[PDB]
Amino acid sequence: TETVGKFEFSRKDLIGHGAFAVVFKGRHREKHDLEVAVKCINKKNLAKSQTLLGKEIKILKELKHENIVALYDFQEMANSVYLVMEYCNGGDLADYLHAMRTLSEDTIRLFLQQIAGAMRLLHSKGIIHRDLKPQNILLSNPANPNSIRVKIADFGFARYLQSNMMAATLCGSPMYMAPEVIMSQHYDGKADLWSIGTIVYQCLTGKAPFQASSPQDLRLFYEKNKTLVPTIPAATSAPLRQLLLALLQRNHKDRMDFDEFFHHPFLDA
Ligand SMILES: CN1C(=O)c2ccccc2N(C)c2nc(Nc3cnn(C4CCNCC4)c3)ncc21
Ligand SMILES: [Mg+2]
Ligand SMILES: [Mg+2]
Ligand code: NA
Structure with missing residues (x-):
């Protein structure tokens, strides 16, 4: 179990992977029923992954709309980046x-x-x-x-x-x-x-x-x-x-x- 702010996830709960990101299902640490998806670096492409997740934060923190994936929180550090995002229960x-x-x-x-x-x-x-x-x-x-x-x-x-x-x-x-x-x-x-x-x-x-x-x-x-x-x-x-x-x-x-x-x-x- 890893935590990011008031949210948590397990890496057992993988819901997507690509060359530049991995996404896990997670939840609010206090209200376990509130589901989220946590997007993380893909270490196999560390530098580019880090760049793209950083760009996604920069853009999505400015866009709030019911038909755009929500960004609830995020955590950027020198060597790691996490986004806490809307979990879409119907897939793609x-x-x-x-x-x-x-x-x-x-x-x-x-x-x-x-x-x-x-x-x-x-x-x-x-x-x-x-x-x-x-x-x-x-x-x-x-x-x-x-x-x-x-x-x-x-x-x-x-x-x-x-x-x-x-x-x-x-x-x-x-x-x-x-x-x-x-x-x-x-x-x-x-x-x-x-x-x-x-x-x-x-x-x-x-x-x-x-x-x-x-x-x-x-x-x-x-x-x-x-x-x-x-x-x-x-x-x-x-x-x-x-x-x-x-x-x-x-x-x-x-x-x-x-x-x-x-x-x-x-x-x-
Ligand atoms: C934040 N985020 C993303 O940035 C994203 C963006 C692009 C593509 C995938 C993403 N990933 C995996 C995301 N995937 C889900 N939802 C999701 C995936 N798979 N499923 C299935 C269907 C029901 N039964 C099992 C689980 C549900 N929501 C938010 C996601
Ligand atoms: Mg894009
Ligand atoms: Mg054109
Ligand atoms: Na085309």
């Missing part, structure tokens, strides 16, 4: 999609309304996420789709981007990266809208809109297709087709912007 969207195969349009709408709410706050604060993918969309059941609450997670790659500036750091997951990102170009907040389009498309169809054998293959594909149109099933509703066509636009200047996204007809219906 990736596992949910694997089980369901595809989601209904109505479920996609409910989830995307929530993602949109979170994105409105990121956008108003001038923050870009840069690692949106189903593994980083968590679910919480307060077990039918109307009651599922979605939370964007894993803000270790997120940054402030001033509205007249562009980012250029290569980060994210290649299958969810906007063309401009994977092509090593400058990008802005609209890169995350491409990622969201990709997630929506994957929920609808069970596949990636642009399949490739490797990251390199995907990049070459984007490079050689200056006009790029996703294959959308004919049976798709007209508003969802319109949303996907506008999000999955190769050239960022032309892509759907945040105001259009937040007010898109698909999200009313």
Whole structure:
């Protein structure tokens, strides 16, 4: 049993691992019924892990929203870092999609309304996420789709981007990266809208809109297709087709912007 502030956890209760973080289920030391998740360094990548957890604290201490994973407390020292975070009892969207195969349009709408709410706050604060993918969309059941609450997670790659500036750091997951990102170009907040389009498309169809054998293959594909149109099933509703066509636009200047996204007809219906 380890303690971090008024919280505790055991390393027996592993609920996630990646190259740059390990997450354990834990609880409040006084109110044992209050569940939390404690994110820790992965010692196999100590320096980068330490950097990314520190960045996540910096960003999440400024973001409070029902559709963003909460940061209850944290502890940073010279040689260790811990985050005490919201425990999402439904796991991730990736596992949910694997089980369901595809989601209904109505479920996609409910989830995307929530993602949109979170994105409105990121956008108003001038923050870009840069690692949106189903593994980083968590679910919480307060077990039918109307009651599922979605939370964007894993803000270790997120940054402030001033509205007249562009980012250029290569980060994210290649299958969810906007063309401009994977092509090593400058990008802005609209890169995350491409990622969201990709997630929506994957929920609808069970596949990636642009399949490739490797990251390199995907990049070459984007490079050689200056006009790029996703294959959308004919049976798709007209508003969802319109949303996907506008999000999955190769050239960022032309892509759907945040105001259009937040007010898109698909999200009313
Ligand atoms: C804070 N945090 C994270 O930063 C995060 C971010 C990205 C990806 C994973 C994370 N990890 C593991 C997180 N995972 C959970 N919840 C979670 C995981 N797996 N499960 C399953 C399902 C039910 N049955 C068994 C347990 C429940 N909440 C918060 C998490
Ligand atoms: Mg991130
Ligand atoms: Mg961009
Ligand atoms: Na993609």
